[PDB]
Structures are given as structure tokens and as C-alpha cells.
Amino acid sequence: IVGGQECKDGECPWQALLINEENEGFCGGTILSEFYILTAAHCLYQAKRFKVRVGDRNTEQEEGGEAVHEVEVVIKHNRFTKETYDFDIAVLRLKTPITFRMNVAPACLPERDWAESTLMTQKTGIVSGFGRTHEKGRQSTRLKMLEVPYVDRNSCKLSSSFIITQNMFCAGYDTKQEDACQGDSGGPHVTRFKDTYFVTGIVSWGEGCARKGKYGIYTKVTAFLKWIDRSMKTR
Amino acid sequence: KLCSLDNGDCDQFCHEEQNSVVCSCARGYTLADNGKACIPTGPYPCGKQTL
């Protein structure tokens, strides 16, 4: 996460981290409930066998409320494809149920129409992760959040170099040096409405980090809602 | 009706069902007696920062 702030105690409770076997956090995720996790459908490639950590805000100083969970099943999206990064979205079912305590709670899943209407028309949104803090840099130790404004879909499509489908949206800044970087994939994008957050995006891809004239591409979560349902009903 | 005004003055989901406004919440919540506010039912409701 280039720029942004630092997630304070129980401030980003829905964050999640997919750690490889060497115990390294490679991607992100979002807690939907005690058994299901929401991630990018393209993070199920950066490893062979991975786990999901929750409750960690600092990767190095064993706080206390951490907890590792094992993946029972992966639900990658049918239509997904690396060639165009369309349908970047998958859901993980954990074996042991996530126990909500401090720094561990789930994010709400909104209704589609109400969401696109009031959540995506909101001014900003929040993205968070343990991702790189400067394109060429080392990953991050602390967990962090960046309030990234929604971008006009046109500009988005103009500023891009790749077809910005209807299953994705832009968010971020044109010049500022603040924009999710490597390692934030699958991470959570939530919108805030009346002190209660709702999942709205999944860190997907981007041309570099915080680049001039380029934005941050997220997966339109509203465009997969129904999918997410029968995905938690298992399928 | 008019979830256009101020989200129907709801707490969360707002619906211009038929002629009037109809509020609703996410899972884990329940709509208050006033049909507008959303109240938790468990100690760890989605969307709330654990403070």
C-alpha cells in the first residue's frame, strides 16, 4: 500500500492474509463470515499450498490475537482467465470457524442495487493489505489502509491500457502516491456508510503502483454478489 | 418512497418498495421497532470495527 495510514486496533477487522508454506503472506482477503473468505481469483496461483491468517496487524511481533486457518475448499470462478483478468474473484471455505474477537470480525455483504446506488456513488472507499509500500520495495510489516476515491469509469477506461470490463472498477488517484501495490491482491475493498462497512471490491490488478495517470483496478463485488451466495451455500 | 432523499432514513439497505420506503439490514442485524434502525444480535456484527 503506497501511502495510506496504519490500521489501528480493531480498525480493519475484516482483513485477511494468505500465507504460503514458507509462512509468507502473499495475498489478501476479506472475512465474510466464520467459515468463508473472499479473495482474488488470481491469488490461487502464487503458491502450491497456502493458509489464511487473521487478526494480525504486524508481521514480525507476535501480538496475541493472531490465528491460522486451513482451506477446506477453494471456489475459483469459472470464467476467470489470466489473459484478461476478467472475473477476478474466488471464495475460500475454512475448516475451523474463525472466532470473532478483537481484530477479527467480518465485513457486511450489501444488496446489489442499494450498493451500486448508495455505496459506489459514495466519495471514497477503503483498501487495505500488507502489500509493498513502494513498487520496488519489500512487503510490509504492519497492516494498513488507504482511503481511495472512486474514479469515473470513463477516465478509468481512458487511463487504462487493458479492457476495463463490467466486472471491474477503478479507484484511486491520478497523481498522488497512494495506491495498493504488490501483495495486496485479493485484499478487501470496503465502502463506509453510517459507521458500518460493506464489501465492495477485491484488490485485482493495476499498472504499477500509484503511477501517474494510472489507477487501481478492483473487482466489482456487486457484480458477483449472487455468485458469492451460492458459493457460501457451497458449490 | 425516495431512498433517494436520505437513504430512506434507513440504517442500511433501502428499498422504494411500491409507493413507500422499506428499510432492511445485512445478516446479523434485525430491523428496529421503528422500521429504520438496524440492531446487532451477536457481539461481532459484520461491518463494525471491533473497538
Ligand SMILES: O=C(O)[C@@H]1CN(S(=O)(=O)c2ccc3cc(Cl)ccc3c2)CCN1CC1CCN(c2ccncc2)CC1
Ligand atoms: O497487477 C498485476 O498483478 C501486476 C502487479 N504489479 S503489483 O505491484 O504486484 C500490483 C498488484 C495489484 C495491484 C492492485 C491495485 Cl488496485 C493497484 C496496484 C497494484 C499493483 C503491478 C503491475 N501488474 C501488471 C499487470 C499484468 C497483467 N494484467 C492484465 C493483462 C491483460 N489485461 C488486463 C490486465 C494485470 C496487471
Ligand SMILES: [Ca+2]
Ligand atoms: Ca502479529
